[PDB]
């Protein structure tokens, strides 16, 4: 999309509403797969709530977009290669574009809570390009997200839940390494209503379950390997007191001459599951997270599907 100059970042709608639009800074990529990053301020100190996403995307030129909450983004710069990180304090995603799969809106009444004493105080903007053809011109971008934000307390808050592992090892050659991801859930019920899965290059499938009684319950499951949005989950589920959260990476070694573990760089791997929820807003809570497996065994009883790629 078209740079902004004079008329600036922020765009009032009402008295209470307004629009924020975090664009890049007229950056012109050198290489293949580059990958930048920038940060916003929030311009209100109050608490706000984030309820709609725009994607300002030239469609030529962008891979992906990612959105985050965070107090400390990983420089001062304008802007800056995100191979030197995202925040420095822990990034909260809130927004995922992908070219293939065009994103799903959140649900009227659903806000991500940003800003006062405890919300987010700034936003970081990922920016992945894909081919740097287009820019044979030396042409700048100022590709993005516009962000629709309020005052009004929502009556459902937007939070995430995220599983990672942290102690995969997948050895070189080897036909399949499972990365099992396992938690007890001690909050007030969450709804889940979007899954985004991340693996690096060895990922195969990803799946996310709810266990009750025993029984398997799926969020989401996908392909690693296609882009990598939020997702709609089909069916609504409530997370409740007592409930497991599983999720399984299935990795592959072939292709790789050494062993792969969990980090940073594209030589190392990830397995991520992003699930996002909403809570009553008396209840509701921004953030889970899942690093552990702590009902191991459970997975003996793990649906097939989990172990199957997608056709
Ligand atoms: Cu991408
Ligand atoms: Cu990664
Ligand atoms: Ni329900």
């Given at each position: 999309?078209?740079?902004?100059?004079?008329?600036?970042?922020?765009?009032?709608?009402?008295?209470?509403?307004?629009?924020?639009?975090?664009?890049?800074?007229?950056?012109?990529?050198?290489?293949?797969?580059?990958?930048?990053?920038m940060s916003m301020r929030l311009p209100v100190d109050e608490?706000?709530?984030?309820?709609?996403?725009?994607?300002?995307?030239?469609?030529?030129?962008?891979?992906?977009?990612?959105?985050?909450?965070?107090?400390?983004?990983?420089?001062?710069?304008?802007?800056?290669?995100?191979?030197?990180?995202?925040?420095?304090?822990?990034?909260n995603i809130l927004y995922a574009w992908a070219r293939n799969a065009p994103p799903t809106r959140l649900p009227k009444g659903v806000g991500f809570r940003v800003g006062g004493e405890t919300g987010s105080k700034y936003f970081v903007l990922q920016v992945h390009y894909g081919d740097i053809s287009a820019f044979r011109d030396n042409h700048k971008d100022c590709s993005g997200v516009s962000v629709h934000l309020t005052r009004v307390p929502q009556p459902l808050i937007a939070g995430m839940y995220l599983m990672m592992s942290v102690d995969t090892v997948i050895p070189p050659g080897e036909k399949v390494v499972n990365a099992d991801i396992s938690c007890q859930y001690k909050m007030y019920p969450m709804h889940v209503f979007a899954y985004r899965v991340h693996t690096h290059h060895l990922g195969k499938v990803v799946?996310?379950?709810?266990?009750?009684?025993?029984?398997?319950?799926?969020?989401?499951?996908?392909?690693?390997?296609?882009?990598?949005?939020?997702?709609?989950?089909?069916?609504?589920?409530?997370?409740?007191?007592?409930?497991?959260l599983a999720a399984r990476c299935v990795f592959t070694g072939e292709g790789r001459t050494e062993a792969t573990h969990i980090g940073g760089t594209s030589?190392?791997?990830?397995?991520?599951?992003?699930?996002?929820?909403?809570?009553?807003a008396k209840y509701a809570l921004s953030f889970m997270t899942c690093t552990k497996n702590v009902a191991p065994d459970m997975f003996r009883t793990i649906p097939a599907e989990a172990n199957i790629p997608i056709p």
């Open positions: 999309n078209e740079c902004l100059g004079t008329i600036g970042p922020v765009t009032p709608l009402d008295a209470s509403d307004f629009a924020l639009d975090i664009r890049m800074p007229g950056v012109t990529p050198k290489e293949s797969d580059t990958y930048f990053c608490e706000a709530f984030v309820i709609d996403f725009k994607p300002r995307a030239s469609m030529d030129t962008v891979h992906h977009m990612l959105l985050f909450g965070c107090n400390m983004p990983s420089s001062t710069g304008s802007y800056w290669f995100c191979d030197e990180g995202t925040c420095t304090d822990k990034a799946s996310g379950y709810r266990v009750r009684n025993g029984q398997w319950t799926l969020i989401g499951r996908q392909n690693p390997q296609l882009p990598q949005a939020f997702y709609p989950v089909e069916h609504p589920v409530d997370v409740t007191f007592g409930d497991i030589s190392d791997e990830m397995c991520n599951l992003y699930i996002m929820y909403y809570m009553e």
